[PDB]
Amino acid sequence: SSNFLIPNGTFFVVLAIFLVVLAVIGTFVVPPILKVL
Amino acid sequence: QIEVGEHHTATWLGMTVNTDTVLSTAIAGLIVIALAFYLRAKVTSTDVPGGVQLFFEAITIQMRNQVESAIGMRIAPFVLPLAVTIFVFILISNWLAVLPVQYTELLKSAAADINYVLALALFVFVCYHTAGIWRRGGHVTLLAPINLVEEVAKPISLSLRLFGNIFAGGILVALIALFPPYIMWAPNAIWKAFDLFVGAIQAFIFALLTILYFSQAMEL
Amino acid sequence: MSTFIGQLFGFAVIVYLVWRFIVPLVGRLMSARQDTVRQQLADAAAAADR
Amino acid sequence: AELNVEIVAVDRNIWSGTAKFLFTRTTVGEIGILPRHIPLVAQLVDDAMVRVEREGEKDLRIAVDGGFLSVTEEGVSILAESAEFESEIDEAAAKQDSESDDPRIAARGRARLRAVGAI
Amino acid sequence: MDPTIAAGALIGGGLIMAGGAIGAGIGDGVAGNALISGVARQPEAQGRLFTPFFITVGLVEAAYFINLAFMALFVFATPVK
Amino acid sequence: MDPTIAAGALIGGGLIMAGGAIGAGIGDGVAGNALISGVARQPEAQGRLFTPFFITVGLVEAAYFINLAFMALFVFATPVK
C-alpha cells in the first residue's frame, strides 16, 4: 500500500558499501594492473 | 496479484532502511572485493596470466582508453578506478538476478530500489563537482538554463535509466510467473538471456557517461 | 508450488545454451590472448639469450 | 574467390597480385574492399596507407603518396606518385620528417610512419 | 468513483508504453542503420563500432524503460485515489 | 463496476500493441534498409552483415515482445479488478 519510488535510508548503507569497494579497488587492483601493463 | 517493489525494513538511526536490497548489495560488494583479493594474490606478471587477471586488465585498459581520450591520465587519474568499480560493482549487481529463487523472491537486484542508483549517481555528482572546483576554484553562454538543468539532469538521468532499465526486469520476472509452469520456461528463458545483455549495456553506458561528465566538469 | 520448477528448468536450459555458445568462444578469446602474451614473453627470453 | 590488386606508381608497377581484403583510407573516411564490390573511384588521403591481406602470407602494408583508387569488376587498382613498402621504410627519417612544415613531405612522413606500424 | 480512475490508469499507462515502443524501436533502428552500414563500408571496423553503438542504444532505450517504470507506478500503484 | 475497467483495459491493450507494431515495423524497416544497402555494396559482406543486423532487430524485438507480454497483463490478468 506504500509508494516504492520514495527515498529510503538504504541510500546511506549502499553509499558506504560502494565507498569501501571503491577504496578497496583503488588500493588493491588499479595500480597493480596498471603497473603490470 | 503482482506486488510492487515493496520491502522488509528496519530502523537503525531513526530513519528506516530496507531489510533486503542491503543483503544483495552486500553480496555484490563482497564478491567484488573477493575477486579483488583473488587477483591481488594471483597477479601474474612473467608467466601466462589467469582469466580474472586478463579480465580486469581488459576492463581497465578500456576505461583507460576512454579517459585519456577524454582527459589525460596525468591530470585526473582517479577517474579510472572510480570508473571501473562503477562498471564492475554494478555488473554483478545485476548478474546475480539470473539465478532462480522465486516461489515473491528476495533475490532481486540492488538497483530495483531507487535509493541505490540515487546514492551512486549523487556520489558521482559531488565527485565531478569537486573535480570542477579542484581545477580552478558550456559552449554557449545564452543556454545557461539548459546548462542549469545540466546541473540537475545528469544526476537525475544517470540515476533514472539505471533504475528503469533494471526495474522492468524486476517486474517481468514476476509477470511470466502467472503463466502455467509447464510452458512458462521458454519466455522465461529468452528474458533471462536478454537480462545479461541489458545489465551489461546499462553498466557500460553508466560508466562511460560518468567519464564524460567528469571530462566536461574539469574543462579548462 | 511449481514456479520453482519453471524457474530452475529455465536456468538449466539457459546454462546449457551458455555452454553451447558463450563460454566456448570467450574461452577461445582469452586463451588466444594468453597465447599471444606467452609468445611475446618467450621472444623476450629469446632476445635476452641472443 | 579473391580480388586482384594492381598498384602502379607513376613510373613503375609497384605491386600486383591477388588478395582477400584491401584496407585503405579515402578522403571520405576509411574503406575496406572485399572480393566483390560496387565499382568505385575515390581519392586516397594525403598520407594514405594500403593494407593488402593475402590468403597464405602476412598483411602487406604500403605507404602510398598521391594515390587514387578504382574498384571494378576485375579488381582494385591504385595509382600513386610514390609507393614504399613496409619492409623498406626507415623509421628514423620518417619520424623526424613528420613534424616538418612542408605539407607534401609531412604527408609522406606520416604515410611512411603508418606503413611500418607506428602512429 | 474508483473504476473510472482504474480505467484512466489502464488507458494512460498504456500510452506510456505506446510512446515508449515507438521511441525505442525507431531509435534502435536509426542507430542500427548506422552500424550495419558502417560494417558494410569497412567490414573489419565492427570491433570499434560497438563503443558508439551501445552508447546511443543505452541512451535511446533509456527513454523506453524509464517509461515502463512509471507505467507500473500508474498501473499498480496509482498515485491518486 | 467491471465493464468500465474492462473497456479501459481493452483500449490500453490496443494502444500498447499499436505502439509495439509501429516501433517494430519501422525499426526492422530502417535496419533492413541498411542491410540491403550493405549487401548491395559488398556482396561478400553478407555473412558478416548479419551480426550487426540480428543485434538491432534483436534489440528492437525486445521492445516489441515486452509490449506483447504487458498486453496480456492488460487483457487476461487485468491488474485492478
Add this chain to the structure above:
Amino acid sequence: MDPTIAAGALIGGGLIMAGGAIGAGIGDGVAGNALISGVARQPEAQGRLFTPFFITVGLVEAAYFINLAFMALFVFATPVK
C-alpha cells in the same frame, strides 16, 4: 452496460489495426526504398538483393499479422468480459 465493453473492443481493436498499418506500410516502404536504389545501381543485383529484402519484409509483416490476429481476438472474442 455491456455495450460499453463492445465499443471498447471496436475502438481498441481499431487501434490495433492502426498502429499495424503504420508499421507495415512504412516498413515495407523504407525497406523497399533500399531495394530499388540497389537495383537502380546494378541490375544484376536484383537476384541477390531479394535475400535480405524478403527477410526484412518478413519481420515487418509479422508485426502486422500478429496485430491483425489480435484485432480479430478483440472484435470476435472480446476477452475481458
Add this chain to the structure above:
Amino acid sequence: MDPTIAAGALIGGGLIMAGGAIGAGIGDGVAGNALISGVARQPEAQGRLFTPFFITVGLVEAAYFINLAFMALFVFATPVK
C-alpha cells in the same frame, strides 16, 4: 445505450482508415522517392525499376486495402452489435 456501439464503430473504423492513410501515403512516397531517384540516375533503367517498385507498392497498398476492407466490416456490419 446501444447506439454507443455505433459511435465505437464510427470512431474505431475511422482510426482503421487513418492509420491506413499514413501507411500508403508515406509508404509509397518513401518508395517512389527511390524510383524518381533511380530513373534520375540511370534513365535507361526505368524499365527494370518497375519490378522492385511494384513490389514495395504492391505490398504497401495491400496494407491499405485490407484496412479499407475491415473498416467496411466495422461500419456496414459492426460485428459486435
Add this chain to the structure above:
Amino acid sequence: MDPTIAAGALIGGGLIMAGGAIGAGIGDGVAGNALISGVARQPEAQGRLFTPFFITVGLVEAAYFINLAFMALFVFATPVK
C-alpha cells in the same frame, strides 16, 4: 440515440481526414524531394523525372481522396442508424 452517433461520426471523419492529410502531405513531400534532387543533379532529366513522380503522387493522392470520400460517407450519410 442520435446525438452520440452524430458526435462519433464527427470524430471518425476528423480522424479519417487527419490521417489522409498526414499521409498525403508527407508522401508528396518525400516524393517532391527526390524530384527536386533529380532536377538539381541532371537539369535536362526533368522531362522524364515527371513520369515516376506523377505515378507516386497518384498512388499518394488516391489514398487521400478515397479517405475524403469516406469522410463524406461518415458525416453526411452515417451508415449506422
Add this chain to the structure above:
Amino acid sequence: MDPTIAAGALIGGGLIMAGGAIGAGIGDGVAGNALISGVARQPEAQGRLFTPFFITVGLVEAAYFINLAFMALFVFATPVK
C-alpha cells in the same frame, strides 16, 4: 443533447487542424530540404529549382487548405445535428 455534438464539433474539427499541420509542417520541411540542399550544391541552378519546388509545396499546401476548409465545416456548419 446538442452540446455533446458541439463537443464532437470542436474535437473532430481540432483533429482536422492537427493532422494537416503535421502534414504541411513536415512536408514543406522535407521538400524545402532539397531546395536548401540543391542551392547549396549548385547556386547556378537556383532559378530552375523553384519550378519543381513550388509544385510539391503546392500539392502539400493543398492537403492543408482542404482540411482547413473542412475544419470550418465542422466548427461552423456542423452537418450532423
Add this chain to the structure above:
Amino acid sequence: MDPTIAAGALIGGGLIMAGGAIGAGIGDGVAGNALISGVARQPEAQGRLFTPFFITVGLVEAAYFINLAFMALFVFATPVK
C-alpha cells in the same frame, strides 16, 4: 450544458497546438539540417543559403502561427456555444 463544450474546446485547442508544435519543430529541424550541411560544405555559401531557408521556414512557421491563432479562437471565443 456549457462545461462539456468547455472540455471539448480545451481538448480541441490542445490538439491544435500539439499538431502545430510537431509540424513546426520537425520542419525547422529538417530544413536547418540542410542549411547546416550546406554551410559545412561550402563555408562562404551561407549568405545565399538564407534565401531558400527563410522561405521554407517561412512556410513552416506559418503552419504554426495560424494554428496558434485558431487555438485562441477555440479557447477564448468558442465558436460553438
Add this chain to the structure above:
Amino acid sequence: MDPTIAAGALIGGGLIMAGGAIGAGIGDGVAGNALISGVARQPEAQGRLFTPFFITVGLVEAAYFINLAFMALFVFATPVK
C-alpha cells in the same frame, strides 16, 4: 460543474506538452545530426557551424517554450472557467 473543465484542461495540457516535446526532441536530433556530420567531415569548420545551428535549434526551442507557456496557461490559469 468544474471537474469536467478540470479534466479537459489537464488533457489539453498533456496534448500540448506531448506535441511540444516530440517536435523539440526530433528537431534537436535532426539538427544535431547535421552538426555532428559537419564536424566529422570538415573539422576546422567546428567554429562556424554554431551560427546556423543555434538558429534552427533556437527556432525549434521557441516551438517548445510557447507550448510550455500555454500549457501552464491551461493548467494554472485556465482560460475557460
Add this chain to the structure above:
Amino acid sequence: MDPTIAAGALIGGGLIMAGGAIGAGIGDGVAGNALISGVARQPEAQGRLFTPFFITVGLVEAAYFINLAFMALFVFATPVK
C-alpha cells in the same frame, strides 16, 4: 466529482510521458546515427565527436525530463483540484 480530475491527470499526464519518450528515443537515435557513422569513417575523430554529440543530447534529454517533471506534478500535485 474528484475522480474525473484524477483520471484527467492519469491520461493527460500519461500523454506527456509518451511525447517525451518519442521525442527523446528518436532524437537520441537520429543524433547517434551521426556519431557511429563518423567513427566508422574517421576513428581518429571519436574524441572530438562526443563534444557536439552531448550538446544535442543535452538538449534532447532535457526535453524529456522537463516533461518527466510536469508529469510528476500532474500525478502527485494536480494543480486544479
